[PDB]
Amino acid sequence: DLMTALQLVMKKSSAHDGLVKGLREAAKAIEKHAAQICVLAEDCDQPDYVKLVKALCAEHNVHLVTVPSAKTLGEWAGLCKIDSEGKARKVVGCSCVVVKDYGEDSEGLHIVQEYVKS
């Protein structure tokens, strides 16, 4: 009902557009004062990656959600083809999905917004 189940709000955000995926863009999505959430994937090897993104998110004030399995981070962020119902997706691995603008369908967003508050 929270955290993991809140991939749906980001489904709606991807539908309505607003997922600024990837670090190169993540940063830009931040400094452009348009970042709202910043799911991350601890699977990333390069420590400077996580240090730098946390530094940028600390510079502004938006949010940081951690989630494991960067492959699943690619899955949630649309970094894949829907394929069949079983979804044999050749998934691309993501490590930052800035929800610039954010899906405006609300719902779980409010609940994750609570987790966002804390």
Binding site: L23, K28, I30, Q46, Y49, A55, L56, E59
Partner: protein, 64 residues
Amino acid sequence: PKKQKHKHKKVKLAVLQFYKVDDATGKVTRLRKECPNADCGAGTFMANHFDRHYCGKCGLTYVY
């Protein structure tokens, strides 16, 4: 021979190669100027070359 085509120079994680958030604390420390052009945002880094500050999104330049 066949004139070859320009291939995009590929630098692994250039965004990581951009800011200097280190020494603990919390210092983003950009290492390349952000182009002044208004449309060009603040995450738009003006590349520096052996003698020029060039913005990729537009053309604003500065030599030294």
